[PDB]
Amino acid sequence: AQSVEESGGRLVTPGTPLTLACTVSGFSLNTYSMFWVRQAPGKGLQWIGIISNFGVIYYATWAKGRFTISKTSTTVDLKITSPTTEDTATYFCVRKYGSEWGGDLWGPGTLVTVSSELDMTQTPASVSEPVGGTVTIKCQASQSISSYLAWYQQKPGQRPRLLIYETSTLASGVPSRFKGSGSGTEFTLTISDLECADAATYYCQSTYENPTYVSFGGGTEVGVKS
Ligand SMILES: [Cl-]
Ligand SMILES: [Cl-]
Ligand SMILES: [Cl-]
């Protein structure tokens, strides 16, 4: 069995550095690359950085200076250099999937409470359709990102789930009702024959392997009309 688990989440005062850990089970860090993603309470997903299986690190432009990623044979660590109230979030470590900076294996996340460039436009912010109807989600990239785009599903209080990678390739266990289309600067997720079980927040991610390119869209809350 293959899984990932974060630990280290705590209440911290501003400026006091802390390190989160991510333990892996059923696979080796010498074979796989791991990345960190955070989510401020009730907000969107935000890509931090990645450590390759050979130890090469890349941070998203915003994250550079603010964090330090390190690894042992078993654990990947995330040090928050000088935490601020803006660093309050659920931190997830994720196993890299495929050829880009997308990921299929997520941990449940660990909570940090701090208390005393490519732009992805995702539309609409919220939408409901009838049962059996079709939902359409648009993602516009401010620069051409070719086919390096992933789609995720996140149910309230749950970890994100990979639906689609490479624009249109379905991840395992994903029903064909989910269709990814587009290329360049314009992308769509279509969810046909809508079910009450599809009610979740969906996110697009620029997966291109470059610090200035990797980014999540703001998300779309999808509901079903009763
Ligand atoms: Cl403290
Ligand atoms: Cl991808
Ligand atoms: Cl991001």
Side-chain angles (χ1 to χ4, degrees), residues 26-202:
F27 64 95
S28 171
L29 294 186
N30 300 351
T31 304
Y32 292 93
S33 303
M34 302 299 299
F35 65 94
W36 289 92
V37 171
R38 73 168 186 194
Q39 193 169 40
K43 291 186 83 159
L45 293 176
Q46 197 184 15
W47 202 99
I48 302 173
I50 190 158
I51 188 163
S52 83
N53 59 302
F54 298 120
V56 179
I57 310 154
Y58 291 109
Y59 295 104
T61 300
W62 72 269
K64 216 162 173 281
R66 288 171 76 171
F67 309 88
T68 302
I69 300 167
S70 55
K71 65 178 270 196
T72 85
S73 336
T74 59
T75 301
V76 171
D77 287 347
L78 182 74
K79 174 164 178 150
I80 311 166
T81 308
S82 191
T84 72
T85 63
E86 205 149 317
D87 301 315
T88 294
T90 294
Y91 286 80
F92 302 92
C93 72
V94 191
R95 189 177 76 183
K96 184 205 180 292
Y97 183 70
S99 68
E100 248 49 57
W101 288 346
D104 61 336
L105 197 60
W106 293 65
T110 197
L111 177 70
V112 176
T113 305
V114 190
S115 301
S116 50
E117 223 197 85
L118 182 279
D119 186 28
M120 295 303 266
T121 305
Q122 198 185 328
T123 51
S126 53
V127 64
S128 285
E129 298 296 5
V131 159
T134 297
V135 184
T136 51
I137 306 170
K138 201 212 271 178
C139 190
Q140 179 199 80
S142 64
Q143 298 279 99
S144 178
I145 56 158
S146 201
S147 60
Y148 316 116
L149 190 284
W151 290 99
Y152 297 86
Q153 177 190 68
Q154 186 182 34
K155 263 135 180 190
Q158 309 309 290
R159 78 198 78 182
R161 173 197 181 193
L162 184 71
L163 301 176
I164 292 173
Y165 62 101
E166 296 183 336
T167 296
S168 51
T169 309
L170 256 49
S172 26
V174 182
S176 299
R177 300 187 298 108
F178 288 88
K179 192 178 93 278
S181 56
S183 62
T185 51
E186 216 66 64
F187 298 88
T188 316
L189 170 67
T190 301
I191 320 170
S192 67
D193 191 21
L194 206 66
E195 302 182 358
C196 232
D198 304 332
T201 304
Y202 293 83

Side-chain angles (χ1 to χ4, degrees), residues 5-18:
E5 188 182 333
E6 310 87 350
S7 57
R10 44 172 286 202
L11 172 70
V12 69
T13 59
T16 57
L18 79 154

